[PDB]
Amino acid sequence: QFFTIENTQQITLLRTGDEFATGTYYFDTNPVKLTHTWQTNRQLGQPPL
Amino acid sequence: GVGVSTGSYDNQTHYRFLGDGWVEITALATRLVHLNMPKSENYCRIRVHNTTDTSVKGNMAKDDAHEQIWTPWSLVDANAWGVWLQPSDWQYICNTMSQLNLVSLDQEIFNVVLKTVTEQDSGGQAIKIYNNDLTACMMVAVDSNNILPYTPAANSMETLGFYPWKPTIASPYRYYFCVDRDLSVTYENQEGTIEHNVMGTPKGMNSQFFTIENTQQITLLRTGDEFATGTYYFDTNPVKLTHTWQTNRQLGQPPLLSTFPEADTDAGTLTAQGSRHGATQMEVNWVSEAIRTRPAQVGFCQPHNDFEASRAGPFAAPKVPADVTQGMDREANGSVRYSYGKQHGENWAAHGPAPERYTWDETNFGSGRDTRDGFIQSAPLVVPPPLNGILTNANPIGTKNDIHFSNVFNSYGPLTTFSHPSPVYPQGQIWDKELDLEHKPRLHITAPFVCKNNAPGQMLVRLGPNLTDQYDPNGATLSRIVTYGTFFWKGKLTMRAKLRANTTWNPVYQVSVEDNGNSYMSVTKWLPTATGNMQSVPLITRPVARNTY
DNA sequence: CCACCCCAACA
DNA sequence: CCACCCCAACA
DNA sequence: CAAA
DNA sequence: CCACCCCAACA
DNA sequence: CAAA
DNA sequence: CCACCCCAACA
Structure with a gap:
C-alpha cells in the first residue's frame, strides 16, 4: 500500500x-x-442488616 | 382534621384484553405497614470485621467485613414479584402469555395512624397503655x-409482605461507604500466618456521605x-x-438419512463420515455432528x-444462568439460590431461626454446559486422540488434583449467544437500576428488567421525632417519647403482554396443580391450614419451547 | 354509589 | 404528584 | 444523556 | 404474490 | 419487535 | 476553507 501525497492530496503552494x-471540523x-x-x-446493594 | 379516611384498598389484579393479543395487566396492592422509632436519630458510620471467620485459613468465602452507614430513615421496597401477583395470576400469565413487559408504577400512602405508649402499671403487674397523638x-x-x-431490599430479602392480609414492615435504609481491604488466600490448615487483615481508614477520595435531610424533600405527613x-413510566x-x-x-439441516427404520426398534444410519458432504472448521476429512460448522456458540463456559x-x-x-446438564453442575451453570423467611414464604408455621430456599435451575437448556465431558484436542485433530494430545476433566492444573481446567476456561467469543435470566415468581426481583459505567453489562442476573x-x-419513610419536656442538645443522650405508627400503602404496577400462539401439534408443558401427594406441585402447598399459615413456592415461568434455530 | 366469578352493566 | 446524584423531564 |  | 413461530407487514 |  | 482511502458532506 504505497501512497504519494503528491498524488492523493492537493497542495497549496504557500x-x-x-x-x-x-x-x-465538527466532532x-x-x-x-x-x-x-x-x-x-x-x-453495590443493601449492606447486611 | 381527623375523622375521614385518605385512601382505599386495592390488592386486585385487573386484566384487559386489547386487540391483537395485546393484554394489559394492571396489578395493585395495598399493604399496611408498621414502622417503629429509630433507635438513633443520628447518622452512623458503622463497620463490621468478623475476625472469627476471618482468622481461619480456609474461611475466605466468609469475609463479611464492610464499612456501612446507617440512616434513621426506613425504606420501602416493592420491587418484587410476589407482592404484585398471586399463584393463580402468574399461572394465567406465564402459562398463557408469550412475552411480557413493564409499564407504569404508581405508589400511594394514606390513612396514617400515629400512637404513643405509656408504660404504666406499677401499682399492679405491668401494663402498657396505647393512645393516639393526632x-x-x-x-x-x-x-x-x-x-x-x-439498595434493592429484595437483595437481603427485605421487602413487603406477599400476603395482602398480613401486616408487614419496611427496611431501614443503609448504604455502602468506602473503606479498603487486603486479605490473602490460604487453604484449610496451611502453615505460617495470614499476614494482614486490615480495614481501611477514610479514603478522603472515595468518601460519599449523604443526608436525606439534605438532598431529598420531606413531606411531613x-x-x-x-x-x-x-x-412512573418504564x-x-x-x-x-x-x-x-x-x-x-x-441447529441446521440434520444429516441425510440413507437408511430408515423398518419398524419401531431399528434406527437409521447416515453415510461414511469421511465421504459425507458438508463443511467443517477442522482440518480432517469427515464431518461429524460435533465438528460441523454452525451459526454460533450456544452458551459459554464460565469459570465456576x-x-x-x-x-x-x-x-x-457471577454467572449468567444456564441449565445444569444431566450431571447437575448446579454450581457452574450458576444456578442460584434463595433463602427467605415466613414474610416471603416458609411454612408460615415452622420453627428454628432457619431460613429456607429453592435452588433455581434455569430452563434455557440447550444452552447450559456439562463439565463432565470437557475435552480439547491438539494440532492435527487426530480423532483417536492420544493422551499427551488431550486435556480432559481429570487432568490436573496448577499441580492441584481436584483443580481442573474447566475452572479457568472462558469461551466468550464474538460468536456467543444466550438467553436472559428469566424471572422468578415469588421472591425473585423485578426491575433494577443500571451501573453508571461508560460501558455496561449486557444484562443483570439480579433482575429480568433493567x-x-x-x-x-426510592421511597424512604421515618417517624418524626416526638419530644418531651426536656431536651438540651448538649445532652449526651436525649429523651424522646416512645412513638410508633401504621399506614397503609397501595401500589399500581402496569404491564403489557402478548397472547401465545399455537404452532406445534403436540400439546406442551404447563403449570398445573396436582392432587395432593408429595409432589412439589400439589395444592395443599398453597391453600392455608387448620390455623392459617401459608407458603409460597417459587414456580416456573417459561414452560414452552421457542425453536431457537 | 351492586349486575351475571377481573378491569367494566364498562365509559 | 418519581426521570438520568441540585434547582428542573424544568415551566 | 448531555444536549438542545 | 415471503416479513419477525397463526389469522395479518394485516386491510 | 413488541408496540403502536 | 477538513467529513468516512478520488472527483464530492458533492453543488
Missing part, C-alpha cells in the same frame, strides 16, 4: 503573503466523565 | 433524583395527610416467557467458583 486555513464523539468511581462488587 | 409526624422522602445509592407519587426491554433448547447439535479480588477484595464472580434510563425513586 508563499510569504499567503494564508492557508481549514474549515471548522461526533461521545462525552467524557470527569468523575471517578469506587463501587466494587462488595459495595 | 398532632404527630411521619417524614416521607421520595428520592427519584436517584441521588442516593440504590400527619393523620389526615395523603402522600402519593406520579405514574423504558425497559420486554421479557420472553418462552424457553429454548436448541443446542449447537440442534472463581473467586476474584480488589480493594474490599473478595468476591465470587430500566434503560433513570429509575424509580
